[PDB]
Amino acid sequence: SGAIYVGNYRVVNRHLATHNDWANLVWEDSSRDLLVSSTTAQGCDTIARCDCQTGVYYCSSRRKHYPVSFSKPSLIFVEASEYYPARYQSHLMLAVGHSEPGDCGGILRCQHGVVGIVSTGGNGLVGFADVRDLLWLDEE
Ligand SMILES: CNC(=O)c1cccc2cc[nH]c12
Ligand SMILES: [Zn+2]
């Protein structure tokens, strides 16, 4: 589990969004596994605006923050999960590291801020849904 809190937006894994998130929906893309909802209170997080390929991610299933190299966001074939059938996931970044389904929402950060959240995993890879292309998160 986990979320990004930037301005009056909450960024969550689409598959973990709550009734409240859907009632207060701003934007969602099933192909990216992202949903953004509106918040009353201001968040503290800064989104990275960069093409960094090194960062650190939180892995709840290890209670550990791991430094990783990761690929640039791309379209990747993702095997079926409990929430999605096997399909191509867009804006996805891969790193060699430990992920379990419950690790989704773990933040990947670089020197510039939040890069994305854990979305996919298994086979010793972790997949992060990029948010850095979502420029509108920084305003309104
Ligand atoms: C929607 N798919 C998931 O819940 C998922 C997310 C992160 C890691 C793994 C490993 C297998 N499935 C995973
Ligand atoms: Zn960066």
Side-chain angles (χ1 to χ4, degrees):
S1 62
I4 305 163
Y5 296 101
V6 57
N8 284 280
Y9 301 117
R10 168 176 144 89
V11 186
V12 292
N13 294 91
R14 187 178 181 278
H15 75 273
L16 297 180
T18 69
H19 146 82
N20 188 94
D21 288 315
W22 285 106
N24 291 295
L25 176 61
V26 171
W27 171 87
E28 55 82 17
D29 182 324
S30 177
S31 82
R32 297 177 68 150
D33 182 43
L34 285 182
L35 178 151
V36 179
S37 58
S38 50
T39 67
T40 63
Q42 292 205 220
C44 288
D45 292 324
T46 296
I47 312 299
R49 303 298 176 191
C50 68
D51 65 357
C52 287
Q53 282 190 259
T54 57
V56 179
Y57 84 98
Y58 181 59
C59 174
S60 66
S61 65
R62 296 287 181 262
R63 293 191 182 119
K64 283 214 172 54
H65 298 258
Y66 288 112
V68 288
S69 305
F70 54 92
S71 61
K72 288 189 184 184
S74 341
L75 180 80
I76 301 301
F77 186 67
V78 178
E79 294 306 321
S81 60
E82 179 139 279
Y83 299 94
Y84 296 107
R87 61 186 194 159
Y88 285 95
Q89 184 167 325
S90 66
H91 298 266
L92 183 70
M93 299 166 293
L94 287 181
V96 175
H98 184 72
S99 189
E100 294 175 46
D103 288 324
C104 285
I107 285 168
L108 177 67
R109 65 184 75 244
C110 75
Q111 60 177 107
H112 306 104
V114 173
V115 175
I117 54 169
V118 175
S119 175
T120 75
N123 272 343
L125 299 187
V126 51
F128 312 87
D130 184 57
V131 293
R132 291 176 292 179
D133 71 317
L134 308 172
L135 299 201
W136 56 262
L137 284 178
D138 301 342
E139 78 220 6
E140 132 71 38

